[model samples]
Target chain A: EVQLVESGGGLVQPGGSLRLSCAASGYTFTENTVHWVRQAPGKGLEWIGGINPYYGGSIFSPKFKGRFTISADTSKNTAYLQMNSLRAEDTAVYYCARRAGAYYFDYWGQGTLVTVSSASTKGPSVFPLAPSAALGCLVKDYFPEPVTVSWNSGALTSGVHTFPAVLQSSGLYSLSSVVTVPSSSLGTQTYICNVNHKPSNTKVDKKVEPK
Target chain B: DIQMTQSPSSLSASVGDRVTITCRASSSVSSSYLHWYQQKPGKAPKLLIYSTSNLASGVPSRFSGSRSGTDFTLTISSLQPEDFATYYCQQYSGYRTFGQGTKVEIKRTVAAPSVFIFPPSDSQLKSGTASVVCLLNNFYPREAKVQWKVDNALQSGNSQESVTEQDSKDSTYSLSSTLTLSKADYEKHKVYACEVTHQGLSSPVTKSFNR
Candidate 1:
């Protein structure tokens, strides 16, 4: 009687980290590898990543590589998967699968569902996703510090940004300036975040809300 | 002999969105070939992959796959809300393994934004008890495993599940299960999943539910 056993489920607050298991019994577990998949509460499925129990080697879908992990123990004939930086978007049901000798999942364990809830109470800290504001800008100046940027909001922002850092000691620099315009005279007040990159100038516009 | 466990077993979504599925092999199916599949209610499965990356011939171009050292992934480039249904992954390492399928369905017709669950609501999240009855009522020669899992964790529950023979001598069989969860257990609960696992079937039928 070949069978795969899975552990019970528990609560996982949003951004919380957790690991789940899939153990096999009545069969040699080493011959196969374990994998993870996700399904939203009532939606479709997504492939997260997989683990090789033999060497502990793993490969992940480009997007899932940073967020999920898989491991296995031969002695107990078990496999495990761990996920981090979880988000409300990460909430879904996952599965431990047995890759048939060929590479396709011929058999599988009943899946485990790790729900994502708001982290009102935290067991583990999570890095918040960076807030992304649309920087509609043009490439501006470029030099030693490389580039400078100006914010449309009348704020001055600059940083040492590295892109494929050809020179570790040398990083690109940018300056952003903020602009202030009264709404009464503005049909649409556009704040331009200007960046002067080497060999180019970029300008971005942020629409100001009318009161 | 690998097992898979997935999270948030069910979900809700609209059309024209991207969707993905993950599968974890039990041991080292890393060397084994793998695939992802999709199924609507009342139909057989459609092939999705082999060797972790190649799309099965004739599969919709919208589907794509990638593999890490062990974790495997299936991604739907664009999802349409009507593209709602269960999605599953299979490992060809050996023994015909399958991930629990994720069902995508429409939400409230009364509401503007809609939602879907991989497994239907009545299937699991009611009063702590969830049961899946394989409609052997119309099928033939029913032999299946009424798999049970709680919150992506596997459980050792009563295995009294079996199919009954049809009325005619030509009639074959039918089986089903009614899973009951302790009300106390359902509250701080994660998920409940039910799968129709049968040898006669080339691929197992799976559905999951959650709160």
Candidate 2:
């Protein structure tokens, strides 16, 4: 069975965006689909969307399009379902369910809980980037969602992006997006690719470029 | 839009039992993308078909899928004990698409379990600002082929037809082809289709927009 462990209880803010992660361990995400489902306080569950690691395909619920996005980093074996326009109505428990077919929530996460409790994180640091030449870690829960692996100097031409096939029990997933430095642009430059969830108004920095 | 319904909510079959899930698409997903999945407990789901009858990469040869018009069938020739799980069928005929799904279980000697299978959710309309997508909603893998047909002609590598997100039961997903095109493209109302063919399967399952 697939075990999904969420990032745990979260305190989000109204008007702020939030990202709920469903980190999966013990299986290769490439061969499967990771779906996101939202449950309101004692309400019927709603299907949001899902990420296909292999083909980098995403299918959104008509009701969720324009308001939510789902992506993954295969190397991490984790999938992310992001929602925007955080009204209290959006406050609820979200879970990551592993799908092998068109039916049933076979393996589900413990559930990621988020309540709009504080102002949305803002500013560059709110979603910082790894300093120039500094080693950075970019975590992707699914494919298709962009990752900013640039350094502070400027946008580096390249880097590596890796999606883990399985998850370790610790629930920590490792994914990297590396862009090979162009021979010409190797001079002092920085790069960062912030996973931008336009719908959710959420921004998280993967790493920085400097020491 | 044809409403698709899957029956038997739940079934009990032994290791050697013959198992089947019936899907009735309300309209015709013939030109759309129809696929199936297998979800086992605590494990990620695997794709059995991408365009209906065509099995995915490593799916067992024993798992066979066949579709006749709005009626789609997924049958396990000889159900292995491990085959007891939930099965779902989906269409990428635009609109949020899915078949509620059926759970196949080992038939018990005492009492049959009560399984409530919901009807597939309606396919939703994409936001105006969002890209318009064309997908092969229903095709059989073994006898079908999925390709992009733009303006009645074949177009390849056009990211414009990227599949978008779909929601079902907490993050479950389906395939969706999308793109942002000019008014001309929209007015043309071109047909995007999936074609299926098998030596003995009779005719191909083709759904189109001309209707």
Candidate 3:
């Protein structure tokens, strides 16, 4: 009764390559087809492609034309996709659904997260928030949120602006914390920023350059 | 115009029984766009049949799908304990429309509920409006199709018809529906009606408020 199981939930570097999979069971796979659909963060659904398990060939959405490949194996009762030339825009939760006719979907696979991000690191990295001279810290490529952020000193008294963590296409999260720095504290003494990830008991401390 | 319409809003069912739920599209639906879902309370809907007749992974052999022209059918060869649920047909072809659901409930004693109309009491009238209540009592199968007509015109949900049901420990059911009318409405509308249809009765029982 294993209906459909999807793979490929992880991070990928922009312009890098990755493969997706949907393992299916409980029926004669060759008689029907499997189709893929993806949902972008803060957006809606988009068609990727579909493949017949036997001699039926494959078809893809014009939106994904040359960048995506779709295939199926009857003996294994599985479907696969190798998306090439990934972009931060290509990040989404991919799903493979079992098809009946050319248009009907009766069964579906669990969603697989394929996040496309600029960060290639598997873990997370702290970077300087771009654009202004403000002392802003950005944490990038952290998986599964509720990652806590705080300053080493009583910087809270000065107030700060912390944006909510946003998931990048790489199945990871990023957020920017803008610490309001007073001119009196703007001397060359560097400030400390701390990030706590309770799930892994991992803590990161970064030194913020003074203004 | 891919609106899907389903028949027999409900059906009598029992364990180890066979039943069929039908859906028909307004125009045409690609076989690939036809899908069936079984929904139970407190859980996400589970896809059962799709693309016309194929069963999804992990679904029992008892459930099957079939299509002919614009008409689609979802049949369960032998109902199981978990098979009692609401089923709907869906299509994603330009117009993502869902059909009226067919609820499969366990069979109950074959007895029809009697309809009684209570005239508006002074106690129920407050701010320029009064209420008439339809009481349906002594029903065995519990569920029935209920509707109200004012001056022989079908009343919409905007009529503020509020229905409540409470089954007895003796396995019988009782239900009440309230229809509110302003003093001006009582004078404008000459007739009020409540219609009830159940499996135990071949014809719908309609009670007219003779006041």
lDDT, candidate 2, residue A131?
26
Candidate 2 lDDT, A45-149, residue by residue in tens: 456788888999898877788888888977778788777787778877776877654443446776655666444323221122122222333332322122233
lDDT (CA) per prediction: 0.49, 0.52, 0.67
Q: What is the lDDT of candidate 2?
A: 0.52
DockQ for all models = 0.05, 0.02, 0.06
TM-score per candidate: 0.35, 0.38, 0.38
Model 1 ranges off by over 4 Å: A119-211, B1-211
Docking class of 2: incorrect
Please, what are the lDDT tens digits per residue for candidate 3 over residues A58-164?
A: 88766677988898777678899888899989888787887664455666787767767665433456544311123545565666444667776555533344555
C-alpha-based local distance difference test score of model 3: 0.67
True contacts kept of each: 0.12, 0.02, 0.14
How well does candidate 1 score on lDDT at residue B75?
Answer: 74
